[PDB]
Design a protein around this motif. Structure first.
Motif, PDB file in Angstrom:
ATOM      1  N   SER A   9      34.785 -79.489 -15.412  1.00  0.00           N
ATOM      2  CA  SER A   9      35.433 -78.750 -16.507  1.00  0.00           C
ATOM      3  C   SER A   9      34.504 -78.572 -17.693  1.00  0.00           C
ATOM      4  O   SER A   9      34.470 -77.495 -18.294  1.00  0.00           O
ATOM      5  N   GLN A  12      32.144 -75.746 -16.591  1.00  0.00           N
ATOM      6  CA  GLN A  12      32.829 -74.461 -16.650  1.00  0.00           C
ATOM      7  C   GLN A  12      32.993 -74.000 -18.102  1.00  0.00           C
ATOM      8  O   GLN A  12      32.765 -72.832 -18.417  1.00  0.00           O
ATOM      9  N   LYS A  13      33.358 -74.919 -18.998  1.00  0.00           N
ATOM     10  CA  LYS A  13      33.523 -74.575 -20.417  1.00  0.00           C
ATOM     11  C   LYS A  13      32.196 -74.274 -21.078  1.00  0.00           C
ATOM     12  O   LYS A  13      32.157 -73.376 -21.929  1.00  0.00           O
ATOM     13  N   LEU A  16      31.652 -70.676 -20.270  1.00  0.00           N
ATOM     14  CA  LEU A  16      32.515 -69.817 -21.103  1.00  0.00           C
ATOM     15  C   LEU A  16      32.010 -69.757 -22.536  1.00  0.00           C
ATOM     16  O   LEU A  16      32.018 -68.685 -23.161  1.00  0.00           O
ATOM     17  N   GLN A  19      29.247 -67.320 -22.832  1.00  0.00           N
ATOM     18  CA  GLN A  19      29.747 -65.949 -22.820  1.00  0.00           C
ATOM     19  C   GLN A  19      30.318 -65.567 -24.165  1.00  0.00           C
ATOM     20  O   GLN A  19      30.190 -64.401 -24.586  1.00  0.00           O
ATOM     21  N   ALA A  20      30.961 -66.514 -24.862  1.00  0.00           N
ATOM     22  CA  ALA A  20      31.580 -66.300 -26.161  1.00  0.00           C
ATOM     23  C   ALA A  20      30.617 -66.505 -27.315  1.00  0.00           C
ATOM     24  O   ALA A  20      31.064 -66.411 -28.476  1.00  0.00           O
ATOM     25  N   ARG A  22      29.294 -69.217 -28.400  1.00  0.00           N
ATOM     26  CA  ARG A  22      29.709 -70.419 -29.105  1.00  0.00           C
ATOM     27  C   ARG A  22      28.746 -71.525 -28.692  1.00  0.00           C
ATOM     28  O   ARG A  22      29.084 -72.433 -27.909  1.00  0.00           O
ATOM     29  N   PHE A  29      29.620 -79.451 -24.842  1.00  0.00           N
ATOM     30  CA  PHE A  29      30.080 -79.583 -23.461  1.00  0.00           C
ATOM     31  C   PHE A  29      28.957 -80.094 -22.582  1.00  0.00           C
ATOM     32  O   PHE A  29      29.199 -80.972 -21.734  1.00  0.00           O
ATOM     33  N   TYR A  81      19.450 -78.247 -50.486  1.00  0.00           N
ATOM     34  CA  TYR A  81      20.068 -77.561 -49.362  1.00  0.00           C
ATOM     35  C   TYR A  81      19.081 -77.427 -48.203  1.00  0.00           C
ATOM     36  O   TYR A  81      19.467 -77.634 -47.033  1.00  0.00           O
ATOM     37  N   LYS A  84      19.292 -80.641 -46.524  1.00  0.00           N
ATOM     38  CA  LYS A  84      20.499 -80.792 -45.716  1.00  0.00           C
ATOM     39  C   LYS A  84      20.335 -80.112 -44.359  1.00  0.00           C
ATOM     40  O   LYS A  84      20.694 -80.676 -43.321  1.00  0.00           O
TER      41      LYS A  84
ATOM     42  N   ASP C  25      28.591 -73.166 -43.819  1.00  0.00           N
ATOM     43  CA  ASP C  25      28.219 -73.854 -45.054  1.00  0.00           C
ATOM     44  C   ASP C  25      28.654 -73.036 -46.260  1.00  0.00           C
ATOM     45  O   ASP C  25      29.164 -73.595 -47.244  1.00  0.00           O
ATOM     46  N   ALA C  62      34.903 -64.472 -30.464  1.00  0.00           N
ATOM     47  CA  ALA C  62      34.923 -65.424 -29.350  1.00  0.00           C
ATOM     48  C   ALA C  62      36.289 -65.475 -28.695  1.00  0.00           C
ATOM     49  O   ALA C  62      36.398 -65.498 -27.448  1.00  0.00           O
ATOM     50  N   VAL C  65      36.640 -62.539 -26.362  1.00  0.00           N
ATOM     51  CA  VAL C  65      35.914 -62.720 -25.098  1.00  0.00           C
ATOM     52  C   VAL C  65      36.723 -63.609 -24.163  1.00  0.00           C
ATOM     53  O   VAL C  65      36.935 -63.287 -22.973  1.00  0.00           O
ATOM     54  N   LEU C  66      37.210 -64.733 -24.686  1.00  0.00           N
ATOM     55  CA  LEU C  66      37.944 -65.690 -23.875  1.00  0.00           C
ATOM     56  C   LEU C  66      39.288 -65.135 -23.424  1.00  0.00           C
ATOM     57  O   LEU C  66      39.705 -65.355 -22.265  1.00  0.00           O
ATOM     58  N   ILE C  69      38.756 -62.868 -20.488  1.00  0.00           N
ATOM     59  CA  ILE C  69      38.495 -63.616 -19.251  1.00  0.00           C
ATOM     60  C   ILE C  69      39.787 -64.216 -18.733  1.00  0.00           C
ATOM     61  O   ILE C  69      40.063 -64.209 -17.526  1.00  0.00           O
ATOM     62  N   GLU C  77      40.946 -74.373 -17.417  1.00  0.00           N
ATOM     63  CA  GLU C  77      39.855 -74.468 -18.392  1.00  0.00           C
ATOM     64  C   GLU C  77      39.774 -73.238 -19.295  1.00  0.00           C
ATOM     65  O   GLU C  77      39.490 -73.371 -20.490  1.00  0.00           O
ATOM     66  N   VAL C  78      39.934 -72.033 -18.754  1.00  0.00           N
ATOM     67  CA  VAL C  78      39.799 -70.856 -19.621  1.00  0.00           C
ATOM     68  C   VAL C  78      40.904 -70.851 -20.677  1.00  0.00           C
ATOM     69  O   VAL C  78      40.662 -70.604 -21.869  1.00  0.00           O
ATOM     70  N   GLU C  80      42.606 -73.508 -21.755  1.00  0.00           N
ATOM     71  CA  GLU C  80      42.367 -74.622 -22.667  1.00  0.00           C
ATOM     72  C   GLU C  80      41.324 -74.262 -23.712  1.00  0.00           C
ATOM     73  O   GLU C  80      41.483 -74.570 -24.888  1.00  0.00           O
ATOM     74  N   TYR C  81      40.245 -73.608 -23.300  1.00  0.00           N
ATOM     75  CA  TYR C  81      39.179 -73.321 -24.248  1.00  0.00           C
ATOM     76  C   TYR C  81      39.576 -72.173 -25.174  1.00  0.00           C
ATOM     77  O   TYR C  81      39.318 -72.243 -26.394  1.00  0.00           O
ATOM     78  N   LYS C  84      41.588 -73.791 -27.728  1.00  0.00           N
ATOM     79  CA  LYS C  84      40.795 -74.540 -28.700  1.00  0.00           C
ATOM     80  C   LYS C  84      40.219 -73.610 -29.765  1.00  0.00           C
ATOM     81  O   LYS C  84      40.260 -73.916 -30.960  1.00  0.00           O
ATOM     82  N   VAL C  85      39.649 -72.489 -29.343  1.00  0.00           N
ATOM     83  CA  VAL C  85      39.112 -71.520 -30.292  1.00  0.00           C
ATOM     84  C   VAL C  85      40.239 -70.965 -31.147  1.00  0.00           C
ATOM     85  O   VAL C  85      40.106 -70.844 -32.371  1.00  0.00           O
ATOM     86  N   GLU C  88      41.223 -73.435 -33.863  1.00  0.00           N
ATOM     87  CA  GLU C  88      40.206 -73.476 -34.907  1.00  0.00           C
ATOM     88  C   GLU C  88      40.325 -72.263 -35.820  1.00  0.00           C
ATOM     89  O   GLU C  88      40.307 -72.393 -37.051  1.00  0.00           O
ATOM     90  N   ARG C 126      46.902 -61.073 -41.037  1.00  0.00           N
ATOM     91  CA  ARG C 126      46.639 -60.165 -39.930  1.00  0.00           C
ATOM     92  C   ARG C 126      45.844 -60.861 -38.834  1.00  0.00           C
ATOM     93  O   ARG C 126      46.116 -60.662 -37.641  1.00  0.00           O
ATOM     94  N   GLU C 179      46.900 -51.471 -35.462  1.00  0.00           N
ATOM     95  CA  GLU C 179      46.578 -52.502 -34.470  1.00  0.00           C
ATOM     96  C   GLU C 179      47.622 -53.587 -34.366  1.00  0.00           C
ATOM     97  O   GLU C 179      47.678 -54.274 -33.330  1.00  0.00           O
TER      98      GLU C 179
END
Ligand code: UVT
Ligand code: UVT
Ligand code: CL
Ligand code: CL
Ligand code: MG
Ligand code: MG
Lengths: 228, 9, 228, 9
Positions: A9, A12-13, A16, A19-20, A22, A29, A81, A84, C25, C62, C65-66, C69, C77-78, C80-81, C84-85, C88, C126, C179
């Motif tokens: 997993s 696989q992530k 992905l 592709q994104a 990220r 991962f 900065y 940092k 940042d 991102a 893209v996900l 897919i 996994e797809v 789940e990810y 996650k995005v 966030e 939006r 949209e």
């Protein structure tokens, strides 16, 4: 952080996340996948390297922007900065180096894996050397040199001169000579000899292998054109 | 001076 | 996290982070600056908006893209990810919305600041609506609509039809209609009326103001060309 | 459909 997720997993992530675009997620991962403790396949090694090269590449680009502003300025903010970003970059390089040392290199017995990981080790010490100024800058440079040299010794014994890992190792070691070690003549000699020896071996290759090897040979030529 | 990219573009 | 850094140092570091393309940042520095509790100048409002628009813009790209897919695939996994995005992204939008609510909008009395912040509020609802599917998707859409509508009402009373904030508000509200709200005719009508009313006011502008207003009018035209 | 960018390009 990824200890509860299955190895497959995580892999696989990581695909992905590439592709994104990220790459921070991709690197996390693949760190989790390495920490499962099994050796990495060829494709998994590429996922690990792509992820970290993109993360550190963005940090390096930002550090260069900030370092240029700081040099032109010479309050504390630009230096703070830059520091940092520099510390974050160093932390990523230390993470990758730690994965290579615990325990990817020691378990790598085939030439393709061992050369790949030692090339990575040279690259991440080279990125540390780009920002180093302190009591250990010489030592960081020597650590990069030593890793690249061991990789070169194995590659010349075990791989054909068109092998893409061998070619990319030589390209990056030549950049190390030119940009880090203040050895432009060694950089030019290595790039020329690598290019010429690959040219002489292209006749052995299939169409797809030819495309991969000539792509890297063009990068060697592009550097030689810039350096000469 | 360019170093190696990770993927074929 | 930024409570110990001076406001002016946070602003200076946000400008450096923009130059270095370090938008996460940049957003954290501008969040710290807002949390000092003082109102923001015009340039500071732009720094806050640029930072978060870049962070959320990368998350949205991102997520798309996900999501694509995931829709084609229909293991976990797809999804789940993507989740996650998505979480966030929602967290960033909630952070910006929280800054606007505590307390940028309530302290904004001039039309230029109040319209700018209400446009931001519409935009971040939006972005929440783009990923919403649950019991509150209708409610999120209404929250975006309400913020954009209040901004439009103030802009039409207080700003000329070429004002760049007024134009960008109308552009983004038209995108909301097309949209999100499934109202393409309202989107087209708003974009056309906005364009025509700005055209008729261009004669009043200096060369530099003309360049700013015509740049946004071209974006309105580009959408009208895509929609008609 | 494009929304507004934050900076003049
Ligand atoms: C260091 C390195 C990394 C990758 C490769 S590759 O996978 O064979 N490849 C990617 C683009 C260039 C080359 C063809 C080789 C060396
Ligand atoms: C919503 C919004 C944001 C910025 C501006 S601007 O600063 O006046 N500008 C940036 C590029 C387009 C426009 C000219 C206007 C509206
Ligand atoms: Cl092994
Ligand atoms: Cl006020
Ligand atoms: Mg330092
Ligand atoms: Mg969700």
């Amino acid at each position: 952080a990824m200890g509860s997720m299955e190895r497959a997993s995580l892999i696989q992530k990581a695909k992905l996340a590439e592709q994104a675009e990220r790459y921070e997620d991709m690197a996390a991962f693949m760190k989790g996948a390495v920490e499962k403790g099994e050796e990495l396949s060829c494709e998994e090694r590429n996922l690990l390297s792509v992820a970290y090269k993109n993360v550190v590449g963005g940090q390096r680009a930002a550090w260069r922007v900030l370092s240029s502003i700081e040099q032109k300025s010479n309050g504390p903010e630009v230096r703070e900065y830059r520091e940092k970003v520099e510390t974050e970059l160093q932390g990523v390089c230390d993470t990758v180096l730690g994965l290579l040392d615990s325990h990817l290199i020691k378990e790598a017995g085939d030439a393709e894996s061992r050369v790949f990981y030692l090339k990575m080790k040279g690259d991440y010490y080279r990125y540390l050397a780009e920002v180093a100024t302190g009591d250990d800058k010489k030592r960081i440079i020597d650590s990069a040199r030593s890793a690249y040299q061991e990789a070169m010794d194995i590659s010349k014994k075990e791989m054909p001169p068109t092998n893409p890992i061998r070619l990319g190792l030589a390209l990056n070691f030549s950049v190390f000579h030119y940009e880090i070690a203040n050895s432009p003549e060694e950089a030019i000699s290595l790039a020329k000899t690598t290019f010429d020896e690959a040219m002489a071996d292209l006749h052995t290759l299939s169409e797809d292998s030819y495309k991969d090897s000539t792509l890297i040979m063009q990068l060697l030529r592009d550097n030689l054109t810039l350096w000469t | 001076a360019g170093s190696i990219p990770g993927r074929r573009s």
